[PDB]
């Protein structure tokens, strides 16, 4: 007639990326980054086109896109109201991730090179942490973006004041305090493609403070590092087998050698040894056909193999490897594998961090340094 389940003795007490991002598609998640592409990591230069309308030299008209924005927003609202009116998932194609539609905000970073950084196509949430005032409080100061949550226990290193609302980017990679600023009155946003220039205005720009890392960047030559390299190569090989139209699914080796050119071909053969065999003569000659007993994994198994946040941690590791390599122990402490290990260990309560040090990304008294100190 009651509960009668002794639950207090048995049980004592989210981010959905785009379908191009969870499928690790190669424009957004690169297979190989060279040295000049690792120096320009997250700072991509303005490339000159060889073919297209902008490749011909001369003046080029920019095109306003406000009929396009409101047409796409009205179309997405029709899709949402046709599907029952709830919240929908829209980012299903690469053409959904253009800047030509939707409400864009900008997000500037305080640090030069953060320990973790999102790739194109990945999602993040805005959480407004609001500590109520002692006793009576009016309610969270309302904010245009994000959802509000009442935080008794401060997520960040410091603690919120009573009656202080702090917005923050929250995802699987990090959690970082953001601060809404209005845009300058002179700056517009030009989206250039091969066909032409397009212009939006911006009105909202956030400044992102020092990140609190939630994912540990692996070290170089680590076991997690080599495991991610092997799993990424295996996922790419499976997706090339899925893309093959031949009835015995078959791939070519130099497609994989074009994608991963730093790999020795002994490792690629090792990945193809199980699940494929090489045909030298007859039909399918010089192709790696799929074995007939091998069941090619489904889409959800391939998604469960490698996560996009592991790819971001690997990209952070190899970019920091390049920067350290170019600059000939203080710098090694500022490497993201050390700082991410230090911060995550401090969050479990293993150890403490010297908050003033050399891992400080500001170079002055502002900002923290995530390097381990003993708790004694």
């Amino acid at each position: 007639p009651w509960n009668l389940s002794n639950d207090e003795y048995y049980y004592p007490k989210i981010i959905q990326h785009s379908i191009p991002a969870v499928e690790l598609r190669q424009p957004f998640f690169p297979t190989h980054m060279g040295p000049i592409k690792l120096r320009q990591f997250h700072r991509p230069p303005l490339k000159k086109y060889s073919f297209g309308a902008l490749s011909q030299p001369g003046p080029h008209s920019v095109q306003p896109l406000l009929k396009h924005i409101k047409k796409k927003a009205k179309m997405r609202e029709q899709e949402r109201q046709a599907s029952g009116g709830g919240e929908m998932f829209f980012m299903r194609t690469p053409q959904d991730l253009t800047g030509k539609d939707g409400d864009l905000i900008l997000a500037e970073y305080s640090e030069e090179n953060g320990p973790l950084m999102m790739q194109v196509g990945m999602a993040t949430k805005i959480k407004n942490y609001y500590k109520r005032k002692p006793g009576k409080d009016p309610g969270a100061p309302d904010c245009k973006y994000g959802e509000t949550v009442y935080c008794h226990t401060s997520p960040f290193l410091g603690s919120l004041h009573p009656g202080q609302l702090l917005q923050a980017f929250e995802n699987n990679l990090f959690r970082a305090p953001i601060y809404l600023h209005k845009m300058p009155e002179t700056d517009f946003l030009i989206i250039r493609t091969r066909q032409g220039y397009y212009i939006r205005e911006l009105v909202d720009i956030f400044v992102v403070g020092q990140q609190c890392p939630l994912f540990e960047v692996p070290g170089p030559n680590s076991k997690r590092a080599n495991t991610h390299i092997r799993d990424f190569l295996q996922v790419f090989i499976y997706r090339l087998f899925w893309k093959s139209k031949d009835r015995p699914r078959r791939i070519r080796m130099e497609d994989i050698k074009k994608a991963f050119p730093s790999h020795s071909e002994s490792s690629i053969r090792k990945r193809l040894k199980l699940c494929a065999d090489f045909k030298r003569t007859g039909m399918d000659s010089n192709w790696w056909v799929l074995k007939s007993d091998f069941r090619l994994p489904t889409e959800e198994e391939i998604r469960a193999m490698v996560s996009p946040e592991q790819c971001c941690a690997y990209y952070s590791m190899i970019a920091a490897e390049q920067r350290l390599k170019d600059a000939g122990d203080d710098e090694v402490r500022t490497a993201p594998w050390n700082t991410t290990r230090a911060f995550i260990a401090a969050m479990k309560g293993k150890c403490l961090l010297e908050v003033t040090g050399v891992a400080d990304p500001t170079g002055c008294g502002e900002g923290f340094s995530y390097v381990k100190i003993p708790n004694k």
Partner: protein, 963 residues
């Protein structure tokens, strides 16, 4: 997209009922349908009607000609000499498909008059006015008329619409499909002292000009199907809910306080179902009717539910509060997702049954706790793996035979066996739990809210089905809404567990490699059994080692056998530290039984029940004892209890005794540990040291400190030591000595529990505890030592059984003067007399049970007595008792009792197909073929029960015992 199989679209229907005569069991009325033809040259219009005598039919006030034929009255011809069951199943499927409104067909074929053809070609409205009469219905409307004199309201006579699925054709002519949605206008002219409850909201109640009768007018503006329209006419006591004011509860007279106490919880069920979904309750009223001689225990129609009065309990009745509470909860879940959102075909029924069962399981989780949820999910999963390994498998969403491994056709709900229907609903809600496991629970509730919101925007339009078909769900629409809200599609999971009809069997065994510190699992599947299929997905395994609990995902492809997972340290055996558990806590474990070289304490293959599986893991006995003691999962404690019966070592006795002594264990684990301890104690006789099992523990927990053999006076206010106290002597009576006789120390203990029982002090009743005491007395009966088939008389009675017989005589006679809540002691004493007759103690005479199986008794007494008569006619090979049971199947007033007799005669058959019996005549084959063909033509549940009985007795081929 929904395209109708009918060439017309029905907009509005008026059902008017006059002259409900209770003496003659007769109704008169008319029906006026408003159809719009969608195809020109409509000519014939085909409607559904059973048992109604059609007087006249007028189309647009012009007299029309109808022809009636029902092929399901006599399925095969009387002069065909076929006697195999596959012939009858194909003929019965063809007959039900010939009256199917889900095709274009129907039983009443009305011809459009000639002058209206220019009205039907350019598609304009047609108003069909049929007037009919039910002369003495054998189905549909059930008239409960008691034989007390007085007025019909003074004796308690009432009518209600009974049946399952599309059974509204049994009391008015309609389009009896779930896809023909229309608005409704319902008028019922009843006696002035009676009330007529139906679907919609009651717009008015006018008197007749003599003021002896009154007409109830109901209107239903939400477009429902004809199959969701119901009726309950009787002298009901009305009670408005004091919390929610659109909810009225109707009971039979003199049962108002029971109704007040019973239906006092329902507002919390309403609040739950409206806060997990975000839609409010779609109908404008809710009505709960409690009736006598009900068809099912709970039926749910549009804006109405019909329960039996046997659910009504008072405040002092426990062990019935959770059952009635969950019956109310599943009726409300079917109000949301069986009556508002309806079915597009007979396929896509798994969607609605799964959503109803899944949200009812979420209600059970919030109300009774996560542990009761896990126990319920495990018992449903064990039920389905037992049924699917027994006979073929349940196929959710078939494609039109798709399932030819089973003796009936799955194309229509009225050809399904009743056990298949029950397992269908069970598998549907477990597959919905699997879809929640793949796509998280908040996205699942968003799917359900999107379906409800499309239906409620659809429910307010007036367009005749341009938009009213958004209230009908399909499989493709459900999967598309899932893909809309989540971005993942579940098509491999749908392809495996819905379209394929099988469960998986796992045989696991491990070996610990000490050199490389790995755990080599060996998981092999039995995929060649008739009910099984092959699993190739991922599989979770949880290993508890000394460093904690770690989860691993294994990829079990077809050629896979050995899975090497890594193991952690054993440094919590170097120092005594606490070993951390599955939750955040940690405990002190006695590591003396563990191996020195292996760190791992226990292994669980598929802990979260994420597949439809049956696991057979080979651990060591100390690992099962550690899993029984220190696990924080009730299904793992239950499976360790189930696996400790094979290891009768005294460490397992210590493990189960420590579980029994332990409060803060879930109570249904201790109730299982009682029976496991009884089995282990029976297996280690000539080794057992002290007293019998659980006796000292019973005197420590439930008896006085100063008197060990006097039980404490009954205080049942804890509800967990009440259940454990009433289950411990029932398991204690299964103790046996070296001579295979129950010891006289346990029988004397049970008799002293019966004598010293004092219940004048608790606020709860004692009927279930005393009934369990009679069950414990019945468990102690061992077979008697008859010499030379000596007649069992009173002098050569066992000295043990004379005390038992005196006690059950005293209990049954005292029940005749001071009755229990639902005659629980009558049921227990009849069951115990059948136990004494099954052994050689009481003479094998069915006359007592034949007197308790008469019509005027309570239905629990009736089904207990009929169970005893079925067991007697199985053991004594009685011909006249089988003819008595078949006659009672043919003409009994209560149809639930007829269904239960067919069910019990299927479960405990008098003979199987392998047996040579004296009861294998051509006469019995002809009687059962006549019972399948004719005779059971009015119920759709007696006919499937007769098909099940013919399959159990004679098999799928030609009855062998025949020329």
């Amino acid at each position: 997209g929904f395209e109708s199989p009918r060439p017309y679209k029905l907009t509005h229907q008026v059902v008017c009922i006059n002259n409900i005569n209770f003496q003659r069991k007769s109704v008169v009325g008319f029906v006026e349908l408003t159809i719009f033809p969608t195809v020109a040259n409509l000519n014939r219009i085909k409607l559904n009607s059973k048992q109604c005598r059609i007087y006249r039919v007028r189309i647009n006030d012009l007299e029309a000609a109808f022809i009636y034929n029902d092929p399901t009255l006599e399925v095969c011809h009387s002069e065909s000499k076929q006697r195999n069951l596959n012939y009858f199943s194909n003929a019965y499927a063809a007959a039900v498909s010939a009256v199917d409104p889900d095709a274009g067909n129907g039983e009443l074929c009305i011809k459009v008059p000639s002058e209206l053809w220019k009205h039907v070609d350019e598609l304009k409205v047609l108003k069909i006015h049929i007037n009919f009469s039910l002369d003495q219905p054998k189905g549909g409307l059930h008239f409960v008329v008691p034989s007390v004199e007085g007025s019909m309201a003074e004796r308690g006579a009432h009518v209600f619409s009974c049946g399952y699925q599309n059974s509204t054709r049994f009391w008015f002519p309609c389009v009896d499909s779930y896809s023909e949605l229309c608005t409704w206008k319902l008028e019922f002219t009843v006696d002035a002292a009676m009330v007529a409850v139906s679907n919609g909201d009651l717009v008015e109640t006018v008197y007749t000009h003599d003021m002896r009768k009154k007409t109830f007018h109901y209107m239903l503006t939400i477009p429902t199907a004809a199959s969701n329209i119901s009726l309950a006419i009787g002298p009901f006591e009305i009670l408005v809910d004091p919390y929610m004011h659109e909810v009225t509860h109707f009971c039979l007279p003199q049962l108002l306080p029971l109704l007040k106490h019973t239906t006092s919880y329902l507002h919390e069920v309403f609040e739950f179902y409206e806060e997990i979904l975000t839609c409010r309750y779609p109908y404008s009223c809710f009505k709960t009717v409690f009736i006598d001689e009900a068809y099912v225990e709970v039926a749910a129609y549009a804006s109405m539910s019909i329960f039996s009065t046997n659910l009504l309990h008072s405040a002092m009745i426990i062990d019935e509060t959770p059952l009635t509470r969950r019956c109310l909860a599943q009726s409300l879940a079917q109000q949301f997702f069986g009556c508002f959102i309806s079915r597009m075909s007979w396929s896509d029924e798994w969607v609605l049954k799964g959503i109803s069962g899944y949200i009812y399981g979420l209600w059970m989780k919030k109300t009774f706790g996560v542990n009761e949820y896990r126990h319920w999910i495990k018992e449903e999963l064990d039920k389905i793996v037992a049924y699917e390994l027994k006979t073929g498998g349940v196929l959710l969403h078939p494609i039109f035979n798709p399932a030819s491994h089973l003796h009936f056709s799955i194309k229509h709900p009225h050809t399904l066996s009743w056990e298949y229907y029950s397992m269908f609903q069970c598998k549907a809600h477990l597959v919905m739990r699997l879809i929640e496991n793949r796509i998280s629970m908040e996205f699942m509730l968003q799917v359900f809210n999107k379906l409800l919101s499309l239906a409620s925007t659809a429910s307010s339009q007036k367009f005749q089905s341009h938009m009213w078909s958004q209230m009908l769900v399909s499989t493709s629409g459900f999967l598309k809404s899932i893909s809309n809200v989540s971005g993942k599609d579940i098509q491999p999971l749908i392809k495996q567990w819905v379209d394929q009809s099988g469960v998986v069997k796992f045989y696991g065994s491990f070996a610990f490699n000490r050199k490389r510190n790995v755990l080599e699992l060996e998981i092999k599947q039995d995929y060649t059994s008739p009910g099984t299929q092959k699993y190739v997905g991922p599989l979770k395994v949880t290993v508890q080692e000394l460093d904690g609990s770690f989860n691993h995902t294994l990829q079990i492809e077809e050629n896979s056998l050995k899975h090497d997972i890594p193991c952690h340290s054993k440094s919590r055996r170097n120092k005594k530290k606490k070993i951390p558990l599955m939750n955040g806590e940690e405990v002190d474990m006695d590591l003396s039984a563990m191996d020195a070289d292996s760190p791992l304490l226990w292994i669980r293959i598929d802990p979260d029940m994420s597949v439809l599986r049956k696991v057979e893991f080979e651990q060591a006995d100390f690992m099962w004892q550690y899993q029984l003691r220190y696990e924080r999962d009730v299904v793992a404690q239950q499976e360790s209890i189930l696996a400790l019966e094979k290891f009768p070592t005294p460490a397992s006795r210590l493990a189960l005794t420590d579980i029994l002594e332990q409060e803060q264990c879930f109570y249904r684990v201790r109730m299982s540990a009682c029976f496991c301890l009884a089995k282990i104690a029976n297996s280690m006789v000539s080794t057992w040291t002290g007293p019998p099992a659980m006796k000292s523990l019973f005197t420590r927990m439930f008896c006085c400190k100063s008197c060990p053999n006097i039980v404490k006076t009954n205080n049942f206010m804890s509800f967990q030591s009440y259940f454990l106290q009433k289950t411990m002597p029932v398991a204690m009576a299964l103790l046996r000595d070296v001579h295979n006789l129950c010891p006289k120390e346990v029988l004397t203990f049970i008799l002293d529990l019966i004598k010293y029982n004092d219940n004048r002090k608790n606020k709860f009743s004692d009927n279930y505890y005393r009934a369990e005491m009679i069950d414990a007395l019945a468990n102690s009966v061992t077979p008697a030592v008859s010499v030379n088939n000596e007649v069992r008389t009173l002098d050569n009675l066992n000295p043990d059984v004379r005390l038992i017989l005196e006690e059950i005589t005293r209990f049954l006679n005292m029940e005749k003067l001071l009755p229990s809540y639902r005659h629980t002691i009558t049921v227990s004493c009849l069951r115990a007399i059948r136990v004494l007759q099954k052994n050689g103690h009481v003479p094998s005479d069915p006359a007592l049970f034949k007197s308790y199986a008469e019509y005027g008794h309570f239905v629990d007494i009736r089904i207990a007595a009929l169970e005893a008569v079925v067991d007697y006619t199985k053991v004594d090979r009685s011909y006249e008792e089988l003819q008595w049971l078949l006659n009672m199947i043919q003409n009994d007033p209560v149809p639930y009792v007829r269904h239960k007799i067919l069910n019990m005669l299927t479960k405990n058959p008098p003979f199987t197909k392998n047996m040579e019996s004296p009861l294998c005549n051509e006469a019995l084959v002809d009687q059962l073929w006549k019972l399948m063909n004719s005779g059971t033509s009015h119920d759709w549940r007696l006919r499937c029960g007769a098909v099940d009985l013919y399959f159990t007795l004679f098999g799928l081929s030609r009855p062998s015992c025949l020329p």
